[PDB]
Write a protein that holds these residues in place. Structure first.
Motif, PDB file in Angstrom:
ATOM      1  N   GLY A   1       2.088  -6.605  -2.013  1.00  0.00           N
ATOM      2  CA  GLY A   1       1.923  -5.681  -0.890  1.00  0.00           C
ATOM      3  C   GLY A   1       2.840  -4.481  -0.955  1.00  0.00           C
ATOM      4  O   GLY A   1       2.600  -3.520  -0.169  1.00  0.00           O
ATOM      5  N   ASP A   2       3.901  -4.587  -1.764  1.00  0.00           N
ATOM      6  CA  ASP A   2       4.844  -3.459  -1.942  1.00  0.00           C
ATOM      7  C   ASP A   2       4.289  -2.366  -2.831  1.00  0.00           C
ATOM      8  O   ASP A   2       4.833  -1.221  -2.768  1.00  0.00           O
ATOM      9  CB  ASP A   2       6.216  -3.884  -2.428  1.00  0.00           C
ATOM     10  CG  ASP A   2       6.890  -4.777  -1.423  1.00  0.00           C
ATOM     11  OD1 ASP A   2       6.782  -4.443  -0.219  1.00  0.00           O
ATOM     12  OD2 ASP A   2       7.520  -5.778  -1.860  1.00  0.00           O
ATOM     13  N   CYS A   3       3.218  -2.614  -3.558  1.00  0.00           N
ATOM     14  CA  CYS A   3       2.660  -1.585  -4.418  1.00  0.00           C
ATOM     15  C   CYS A   3       2.342  -0.354  -3.578  1.00  0.00           C
ATOM     16  O   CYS A   3       1.753  -0.472  -2.468  1.00  0.00           O
ATOM     17  CB  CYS A   3       1.407  -2.042  -5.129  1.00  0.00           C
ATOM     18  SG  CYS A   3       1.803  -3.196  -6.470  1.00  0.00           S
TER      19      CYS A   3
ATOM     20  N   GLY B   1      17.640   6.547  -7.763  1.00  0.00           N
ATOM     21  CA  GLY B   1      16.841   7.003  -6.634  1.00  0.00           C
ATOM     22  C   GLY B   1      16.777   5.918  -5.585  1.00  0.00           C
ATOM     23  O   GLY B   1      17.633   5.045  -5.525  1.00  0.00           O
ATOM     24  N   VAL B   2      15.799   6.084  -4.718  1.00  0.00           N
ATOM     25  CA  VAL B   2      15.621   5.193  -3.556  1.00  0.00           C
ATOM     26  C   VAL B   2      14.141   4.841  -3.472  1.00  0.00           C
ATOM     27  O   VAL B   2      13.325   5.733  -3.583  1.00  0.00           O
ATOM     28  CB  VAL B   2      16.067   5.886  -2.249  1.00  0.00           C
ATOM     29  CG1 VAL B   2      15.750   5.011  -1.046  1.00  0.00           C
ATOM     30  CG2 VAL B   2      17.556   6.181  -2.298  1.00  0.00           C
ATOM     31  N   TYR B   3      13.801   3.583  -3.226  1.00  0.00           N
ATOM     32  CA  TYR B   3      12.381   3.193  -3.077  1.00  0.00           C
ATOM     33  C   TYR B   3      12.154   2.494  -1.749  1.00  0.00           C
ATOM     34  O   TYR B   3      13.069   1.853  -1.234  1.00  0.00           O
ATOM     35  CB  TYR B   3      11.903   2.322  -4.233  1.00  0.00           C
ATOM     36  CG  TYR B   3      12.211   0.851  -4.143  1.00  0.00           C
ATOM     37  CD1 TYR B   3      13.474   0.369  -4.439  1.00  0.00           C
ATOM     38  CD2 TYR B   3      11.203  -0.050  -3.847  1.00  0.00           C
ATOM     39  CE1 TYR B   3      13.757  -0.979  -4.407  1.00  0.00           C
ATOM     40  CE2 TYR B   3      11.484  -1.396  -3.780  1.00  0.00           C
ATOM     41  CZ  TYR B   3      12.759  -1.875  -4.063  1.00  0.00           C
ATOM     42  OH  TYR B   3      13.072  -3.212  -3.992  1.00  0.00           O
ATOM     43  N   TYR B   4      10.928   2.587  -1.284  1.00  0.00           N
ATOM     44  CA  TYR B   4      10.514   1.891  -0.064  1.00  0.00           C
ATOM     45  C   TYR B   4       9.931   0.529  -0.445  1.00  0.00           C
ATOM     46  O   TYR B   4       8.980   0.415  -1.197  1.00  0.00           O
ATOM     47  CB  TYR B   4       9.510   2.693   0.737  1.00  0.00           C
ATOM     48  CG  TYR B   4       9.167   1.981   2.018  1.00  0.00           C
ATOM     49  CD1 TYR B   4      10.172   1.687   2.944  1.00  0.00           C
ATOM     50  CD2 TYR B   4       7.879   1.534   2.240  1.00  0.00           C
ATOM     51  CE1 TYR B   4       9.865   1.001   4.120  1.00  0.00           C
ATOM     52  CE2 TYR B   4       7.571   0.857   3.417  1.00  0.00           C
ATOM     53  CZ  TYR B   4       8.555   0.640   4.358  1.00  0.00           C
ATOM     54  OH  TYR B   4       8.274  -0.111   5.492  1.00  0.00           O
ATOM     55  N   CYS B   5      10.462  -0.480   0.221  1.00  0.00           N
ATOM     56  CA  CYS B   5      10.029  -1.879   0.092  1.00  0.00           C
ATOM     57  C   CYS B   5       9.383  -2.338   1.406  1.00  0.00           C
ATOM     58  O   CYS B   5      10.120  -2.723   2.360  1.00  0.00           O
ATOM     59  CB  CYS B   5      11.219  -2.724  -0.259  1.00  0.00           C
ATOM     60  SG  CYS B   5      10.791  -4.478  -0.440  1.00  0.00           S
ATOM     61  N   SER B   6       8.047  -2.343   1.460  1.00  0.00           N
ATOM     62  CA  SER B   6       7.282  -2.671   2.694  1.00  0.00           C
ATOM     63  C   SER B   6       7.536  -4.123   3.115  1.00  0.00           C
ATOM     64  O   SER B   6       7.528  -4.374   4.323  1.00  0.00           O
ATOM     65  CB  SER B   6       5.813  -2.381   2.539  1.00  0.00           C
ATOM     66  OG  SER B   6       5.208  -3.198   1.548  1.00  0.00           O
TER      67      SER B   6
ATOM     68  N   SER C   1       0.833  -1.219   0.000  1.00  0.00           N
ATOM     69  CA  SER C   1       0.000   0.000   0.000  1.00  0.00           C
ATOM     70  C   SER C   1       0.862   1.262   0.000  1.00  0.00           C
ATOM     71  O   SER C   1       2.083   1.171   0.312  1.00  0.00           O
ATOM     72  CB  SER C   1      -0.950   0.026   1.189  1.00  0.00           C
ATOM     73  OG  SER C   1      -0.218   0.164   2.402  1.00  0.00           O
ATOM     74  N   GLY C   2       0.238   2.379  -0.384  1.00  0.00           N
ATOM     75  CA  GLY C   2       0.849   3.704  -0.363  1.00  0.00           C
ATOM     76  C   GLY C   2       0.283   4.652  -1.372  1.00  0.00           C
ATOM     77  O   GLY C   2      -0.208   4.218  -2.409  1.00  0.00           O
ATOM     78  N   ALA C   3       0.429   5.937  -1.116  1.00  0.00           N
ATOM     79  CA  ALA C   3      -0.044   7.024  -1.958  1.00  0.00           C
ATOM     80  C   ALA C   3       0.907   8.216  -1.977  1.00  0.00           C
ATOM     81  O   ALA C   3       1.765   8.330  -1.128  1.00  0.00           O
ATOM     82  CB  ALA C   3      -1.402   7.467  -1.492  1.00  0.00           C
ATOM     83  N   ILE C   4       0.722   9.042  -2.978  1.00  0.00           N
ATOM     84  CA  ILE C   4       1.361  10.369  -3.089  1.00  0.00           C
ATOM     85  C   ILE C   4       0.293  11.427  -2.845  1.00  0.00           C
ATOM     86  O   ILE C   4      -0.834  11.310  -3.434  1.00  0.00           O
ATOM     87  CB  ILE C   4       1.968  10.562  -4.483  1.00  0.00           C
ATOM     88  CG1 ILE C   4       2.829   9.391  -4.955  1.00  0.00           C
ATOM     89  CG2 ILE C   4       2.714  11.880  -4.495  1.00  0.00           C
ATOM     90  CD1 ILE C   4       3.214   9.489  -6.420  1.00  0.00           C
TER      91      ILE C   4
END
Ligand SMILES: [Zn+2]
Length: 140
Positions: free
Chosen positions: A102-104, A55-60, A1-4
């Motif tokens: 779930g990382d989306c 760049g850098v990404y978040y991996c839940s 999950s996640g949003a901008i």
């Protein structure tokens, strides 16, 4: 999950959009896996306006942020996942890295701001739906 949260917009994966998102729809595109809904509150996320490929990404699924190289946004064949059939997805960037469904929604960021959100995974790659071409997120 996640949003901008940029201005009065909420950017999510189309496949994770809620009823409220659809009831406040601004724009959606299945081929990009993106949906934008309108917000009552002003967000402060800065969208990158650039052609960065690092760049850098978040991996839940790892509770970690990983530095990555990534391809420029392209039309790519994506193998079937839990949430989409095998199909072409547009405006998609790939990196070598971990991604599960779930990382989306995990943010990819560069020195200029938010690049995009995790949208695809599997076979040791992570795919990100680009938002840097959506210049209207910055206005209205
Ligand atoms: Zn950048």
């Amino acid at each position: 999950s996640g949003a901008i949260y940029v201005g009065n917009y909420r950017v999510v994966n189309r496949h994770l959009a809620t009823h409220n998102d659809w009831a406040n729809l601004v724009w959606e595109d299945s081929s990009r896996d993106l949906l934008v809904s309108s917000t009552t509150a002003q967000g402060c996320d800065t969208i990158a306006r650039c052609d960065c490929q690092t760049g850098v990404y978040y991996c839940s699924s790892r509770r970690k942020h990983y530095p990555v190289s990534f391809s420029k946004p392209s039309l790519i064949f994506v193998e079937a996942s839990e949430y989409y059939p095998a199909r072409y997805q547009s405006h998609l960037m790939l990196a070598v890295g971990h991604s599960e469904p779930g990382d989306c929604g995990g943010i990819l960021r560069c020195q200029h701001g938010v690049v995009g959100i995790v949208s695809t995974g599997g076979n040791g790659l992570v795919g990100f739906a680009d938002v840097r071409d959506l210049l209207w997120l910055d206005e209205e």
